[PDB]
Symmetry: D2
Subunit: 125 residues, 4 copies
Amino acid sequence: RLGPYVEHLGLQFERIDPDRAVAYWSVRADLLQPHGILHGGVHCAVVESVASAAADRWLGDRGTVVGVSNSTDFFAPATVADGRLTSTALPVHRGATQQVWSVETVDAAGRLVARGQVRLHNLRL
Amino acid sequence: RLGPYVEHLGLQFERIDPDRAVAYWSVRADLLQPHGILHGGVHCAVVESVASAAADRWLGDRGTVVGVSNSTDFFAPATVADGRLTSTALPVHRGATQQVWSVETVDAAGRLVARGQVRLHNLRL
Amino acid sequence: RLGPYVEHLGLQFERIDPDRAVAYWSVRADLLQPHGILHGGVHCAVVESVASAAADRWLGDRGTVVGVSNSTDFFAPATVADGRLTSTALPVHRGATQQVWSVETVDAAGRLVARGQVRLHNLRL
Amino acid sequence: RLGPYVEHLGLQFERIDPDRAVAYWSVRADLLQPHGILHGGVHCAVVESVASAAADRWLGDRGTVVGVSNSTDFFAPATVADGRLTSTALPVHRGATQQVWSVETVDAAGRLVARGQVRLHNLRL
């Protein structure tokens, strides 16, 4: 119900509020880059997905949000062995025309694996 | 031969030199976000892929490269109607421990659709 | 005691711990850009200063830190009328070779005026 | 004629066209951070200044530009010994509401010392 690429990423949303969105997912064989770790683009795509879900839910019927930019740091290699990742988008700024959200991706232990900042534009009715 | 996620993205590399990498690809139905345009994470993933290919080819047998960060701007909506996209990674800095590459994604007309900067770490032998 | 540019910025540090640094400062006539608001570079410089102070204090005698990159968003115009700004650097990642800190600059009301992410390299002994 | 902070930075503009701006400047004792190299915020401030000059000149009488964000990488330490730096802003995207410019700061040899991407908003009449 969130689009076909989000389905392919395997994201499962636990919460989508106007102030927070949370999704679980896992590293998979088809999501890896040649040396057995998660392709970095997957981290960016998950950050984009989780922040966009939250931004959309915050704007509500007032308009539609369009991605502007995405800056993601990869802090640790993620593999299939690492189990279930949790990505949490938190608001940084939510105004008339712009939103910025911060998305942290952590493992079961709370180790920060990746983190991204997502700027989106509000297309208001 | 470039990994399973790169295959899923549909990237077709035309050139992978130590100083430039070029890949073609297209927007597809399964790569879209709910309102019929390319999911933004796909832009980031392609930027990551094309820059990593170039960085790897520049480091050669001297070591291996690991993604550090990825900052991608999305400048225009891309749809299935927009045809074939061309992503070109050009070097910004290539040193002992770090590389930075700049990747521009353009349409057939030369319209810049997205652009990303990719920082990678050199793990040398 | 923090360098001549930090002095020129007018930063006054309230706290410099291995896990947090806090500085106060104010918009001034000489820090403005042509239309009476704070020059954006001042926001970046303050973010750099406050994060570097914290990173240095966390690395301690173990080595020295060198700025790598600085990404600052400006969310609201700051003027002389806006009074005293408070910049707080919080750790995102602190590892062997790299540190990342997040610096928020707020006004008296808690309005977020600017926010920056600072990546630094640890040059260890 | 470009504001008081730009004056303090010592920037001297050689060219300000709608498609390029070029300024010269030098590392100075008061611009340094505690270990004798250029404070990183100075690099960001120069990137902001040179890109804003170009963006303003491109928008012309049509409106006014406001800084949105600034992402600067520092690639080599700059000192007083390094002589005259040249900062060149080139356009990445110039549209209805947004502009993005890329600013490279080089030394006399063409060594890239720092590079920044500056996003600005067009406030049109």
